[PDB]
Amino acid sequence: MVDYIVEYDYDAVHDDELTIRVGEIIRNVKKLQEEGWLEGELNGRRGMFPDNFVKEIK
């Protein structure tokens, strides 16, 4: 469930991270071993992104 919304942009540094822009919706967000990051789907891709750059949806 929990799809989140971007509030601050970010540019994927690491191969596995996403590039996100404010206002966008990330789907199927899942928590990971790593602290402070979340896994999601965007523009047909899954990647990690900072849990402190968005907000849950509900």
Partner: peptide, 9 residues
């Protein structure tokens, strides 16, 4: 506070 990404691993 313009967010900062917590470093990895």
């Amino acid at each position: 506070g313009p967010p900062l990404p917590r470093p990895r691993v």
